[PDB]
Nucleic acid binder design. Structure first.
Lengths: 141, 28, 129, 149
RNA sequence: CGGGGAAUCAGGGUUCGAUUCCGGAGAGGGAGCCUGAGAAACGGCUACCACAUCCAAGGAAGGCAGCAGGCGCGCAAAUUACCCACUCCCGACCCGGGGAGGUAGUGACGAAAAAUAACAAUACAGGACUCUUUCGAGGCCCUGUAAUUGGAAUGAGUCCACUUUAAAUCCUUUAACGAGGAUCCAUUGGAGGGCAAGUCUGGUGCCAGCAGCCGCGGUAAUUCCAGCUCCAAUAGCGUAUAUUAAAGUUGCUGCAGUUAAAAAGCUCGUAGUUGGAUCUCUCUCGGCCGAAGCGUUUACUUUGAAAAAAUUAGAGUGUUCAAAGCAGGCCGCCUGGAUACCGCAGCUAGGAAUAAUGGAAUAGGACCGCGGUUCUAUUUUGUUGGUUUUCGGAACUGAGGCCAUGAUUAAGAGGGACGGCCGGGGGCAUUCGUAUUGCGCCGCUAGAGGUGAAAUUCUUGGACCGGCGCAAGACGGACCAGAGCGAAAGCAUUUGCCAAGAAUGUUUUCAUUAAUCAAGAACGAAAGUCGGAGGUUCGAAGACGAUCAGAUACCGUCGUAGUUCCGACCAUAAACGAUGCCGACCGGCGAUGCGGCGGCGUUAUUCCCAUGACCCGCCGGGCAGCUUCCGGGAAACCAAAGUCUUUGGGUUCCGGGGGGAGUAUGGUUGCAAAGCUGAAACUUAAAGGAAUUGACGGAAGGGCACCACCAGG
RNA sequence: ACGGUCGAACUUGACUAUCUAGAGGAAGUAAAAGUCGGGUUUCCGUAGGUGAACCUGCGGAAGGAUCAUUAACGG
């Protein structure tokens, strides 16, 4: 079993940290290899340039084409794919456009039908997609 | 990346390149 | 090997109480075991016993009254201060009305209530209820 | 259980409660002590002396009659050996196993049992060094062991 | 950067702390200085390095990680405002100065208070009290629909003035104006489940899309897009990300390791951790007390004094309440501005259980007196020079008396002895047995082999078969068991030799010498690799023969490495009980193996006495079995996988959803093969474990039928 | 000005680490309906067969469905 002596403190804490390294979330947070593979680089949001528009095919039980965008982030040059949520909202996006992107909700994990998309478009040309969709504001170019 | 001083050297190199691009664009 | 003879004695008492028996033989004997049984006897929990005095470590046969639910040891014998006795009696005891932390202090082996009365702390030995 | 075996046996002596010398034993402590002295002069370990005294002379326990145990009497008069009895027997056994392994090289079990005997020798040597019975510079070495016996 | 501290939290904990208080460091990077009480100072100097300003081209001048401000960077952060009035600081100083600091501006970081309407009369509508058999009849409240009315109260704003202040602004105080629903109009998300609230209507038709997850959408969509309605919070509400609780999914409290992820092949062993009983204050100096030693030293526990404020907790106090603040209250007085907590380490004084440790066993041991040797007394030899004053104090010593003189007992802990045994335990030599193969000779025959059939192959030069022999290497059957031995891998012909070993027996000896073990070390099936020997059988590779719409595994003949021995390597197995070791307790029963004990009897042709073989019991350690509603468990089941939320005997290894992957890389070992250690990106909503029914069987048995057959029309 | 001291930094080779242009090679992807077309109970470790899978050899497991017989042995 466990050691329960009055002098077993360093054995307990050493075994604790060694088996702490076997925790998946702990190893994601503390090893520092997931943070450098993360394109946002420990940021809630990133801002990039639209490279192209992509139709991503939905996974097996669902049949749909999800309108996504290949973006290159400004601060590190990495390339990501971001989902444009509502219907007709890809038409508000043009090529070589300035776009604010956030994660999609599962912390770097792909969500739902879309294979390999962790990000969603929040703002297009420094105006929100919500205000464009609801028709509150107009978009410059 | 490793080697804190070499990481700082890489950051300084990227700073120099981006600043050179900025000054090249602004003076025109 | 056999370490902590108090743990063996308390486990034997618990196991034969759970079985419904009337007498328990526990070997070896010690002063700590006799003091623990004296404390546990004064609260009417166990009954009265004989120390079979062989020339080795003795034996004890203790009568059993059906009033015991659980008698137990705490290993290791942690240091308990009066500021920390409330947490121990919250952790180990089923209720605030009954149950007993036995502890050894420089005033002797006693209960947590007598330790509060005499304003002493010590090292924890057990609990019974 | 055993130190180096899987066995957990119960073969051992059981002294009685009675520590008093039996009334039929008409031997004083001095007679038993001189008997121990002459048996040691014949040359016997205290186990052998105790067995001879128990079997033939009717002495149930030496320390119940004389008050003192055999090796302390031998040390007090001065016939105790320099190395203890059990350590001597272990070293002798190790020497015999080493001789067998010198004769027979492929005997792996003899090597294994020799390793166990050396472990017991080192344990006893450490214990005797703690009790200042052996000198602190004492050591068991592979080559010069048969010289000690 | 470190602390004070912060978020979260039952208890334990996890995480944060660049950030106004304390400490440190540095002014683009390094380096060297001057002045000075104080600097290796940068709103000082001198260089070099990197930047960069003005040039008349010789020269000159730089340092916002101060306040504003700008560029750049980014997901990410405010005015090139006013004042030294408050707080303080500097100076030669009541006077001057302060982008310290204060005041405004920006400010949905965050926190506190708090509008968006209330009421009355009527028309319906409920629920009550009284009277009535009931229906009903009323004077009692309540509710909204009010496509019904009615005046009253208002703050938002507009805006004189006072108050505030350095001057203002704001707040407060106040004239005047300012409210009927088309207004002075409240949003953000959602309505299948989790999770509160529509099977509404229209549109779309696996599209567009929704959907954290499960899922919805392929023509009746409770899920998309809208309308209506409804639900939650509400001046706020979404979303992304870091973190905390949920997570007893990191487990000290408090998890797991038979079958679900998981115990090392096995043993030894160092560090580490843990470790059986046992033992109930005084002699000298000073006024019954103070000083001096303590007492083996600790660990523990209680107390005391030190631990900055702020923050936390908390006392008082109507900031109009509150968050706050440290103020305030009474007719010049009365007052407050407490207190608690503040690990650990360090002090300090009591307690002595628990846990370490010690004091006498070559007795150069305690307590007393009896003497010597050496070094010394700082005063009594009025003043002295003195050889001597005496006395008293330290260390080495010789006997003596004295102590009840001095050794807890002997663990259902361990080691070592001794005894009679016991076993496929190991090593070496030796003995035997058959079978197979090869060979020789003799006999008689045309077949023999192999297969489901064949074929390849051998063969009248005489195969196969039968007999007599010889040799070679292999292997030790049946006896052989739920029997035994060994740490495991494993171990079976005779005899001899060699050293081991368990168990049992002992009124033997030692006396804690122990358990589990990082590092390290021996052994480790088969296969495989190096050298030598030998090759009977078998036999991976390989060569043939068969077999088929498409067969290249199966089958048969031959056969190489190997299989065997010796010496070196390798260290892997479903190396299994898919179950760490040591210790304790909790039901029962009789078989077996070894040892011991007690026995009435049968047998060694009745045995003359013990001894062997049986028979009946008992004890100890074993290999196992049966039985049980002991208790557990997801269960199958398990006397342990029990004594677990009534959770702590000691200790080692080791798991944390499925894959990538025991892979890459690095290190290390190895001749090699490979062994040990061992990731990440990325991907996934599952994978798994136990049980429970039985569509369907190309599963099997039966029965029935001229809408089935047989014999026929 | 010689000398000493502290010492920025400069030059040369090695060890490197990072930033930044590249002829070429090997690829994959979107566009061409263009041309031709039976065996296995389930495994483990090692070795061979073309790498893996799979098969075979050697040694191991069950994590694989036990019916029937068994009291005499003395003359």
């Amino acid at each position: 079993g466990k050691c329960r002596g009055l002098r077993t403190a360093r054995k307990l804490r050493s075994h604790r940290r060694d088996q702490k390294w076997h925790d998946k979330q702990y190893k994601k947070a503390h090893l520092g290899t997931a943070l450098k593979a993360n394109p946002f680089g420990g940021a809630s949001h990133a801002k990039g340039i639209v490279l192209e528009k992509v139709g991503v095919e939905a996974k097996q039980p669902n049949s749909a084409i999800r309108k996504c965008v290949r973006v290159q982030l400004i601060k590190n040059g990495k390339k990501i794919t971001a989902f444009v949520p509502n219907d007709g909202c890809l038409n508000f996006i043009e090529e070589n456009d300035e776009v604010l992107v956030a994660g999609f909700g599962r912390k770097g994990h792909a969500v739902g039908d879309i294979p390999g998309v962790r990000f969603k478009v929040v703002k297009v040309a420094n105006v929100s997609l919500l205000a464009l969709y609801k028709g509150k504001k107009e978009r410059p170019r | 990346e490793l080697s804190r001083v070499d990481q700082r050297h890489r950051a300084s190199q990227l700073r120099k390149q981006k600043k050179e691009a900025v000054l090249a664009e602004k003076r025109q | 090997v056999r370490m902590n003879v108090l743990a063996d004695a308390l486990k034997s008492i618990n196991n034969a109480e759970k079985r419904g028996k009337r007498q328990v033989l526990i070997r070896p004997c010690s002063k700590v075991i006799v003091r623990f049984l004296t404390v546990m006897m004064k609260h009417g929990y166990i009954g009265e016993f004989e120390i079979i005095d062989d020339h080795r470590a003795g034996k004890i046969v203790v009568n059993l009254t059906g009033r015991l639910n659980k008698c137990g040891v705490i290993s290791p014998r942690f240091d308990v201060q009066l500021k920390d006795l409330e947490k121990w009696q919250n952790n180990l005891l089923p209720s605030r009305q009954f149950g007993f932390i036995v502890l050894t202090t420089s005033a002797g082996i006693m209960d947590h209530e007598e330790a509060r009365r005499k304003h002493t702390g010590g090292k924890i030995l057990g609990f019974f209820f | 259980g055993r130190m180096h075996a899987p066995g957990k046996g119960l073969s051992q002596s059981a002294l009685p409660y009675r520590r008093s010398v039996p009334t039929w034993l008409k031997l004083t402590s001095d007679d038993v002590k001189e008997q121990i002295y002459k048996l040691a002069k014949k040359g016997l370990t205290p186990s052998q002396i105790g067995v001879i005294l128990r079997d033939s002379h009717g002495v149930a326990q030496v320390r119940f009659v004389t008050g003192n145990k055999i090796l302390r009497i031998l040390k007090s008069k001065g016939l105790a050996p320099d190395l203890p009895e059990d350590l001597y027997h272990l070293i002798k056994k190790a020497v015999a196993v080493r001789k067998h392994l010198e004769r027979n090289r492929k005997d792996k079990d003899a090597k294994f049992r020799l390793i166990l005997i050396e472990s017991r020798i080192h344990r006893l040597a450490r214990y005797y060094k703690t009790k200042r019975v052996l000198p602190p510079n004492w050591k068991y070495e592979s080559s010069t062991a048969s010289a000690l016996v």
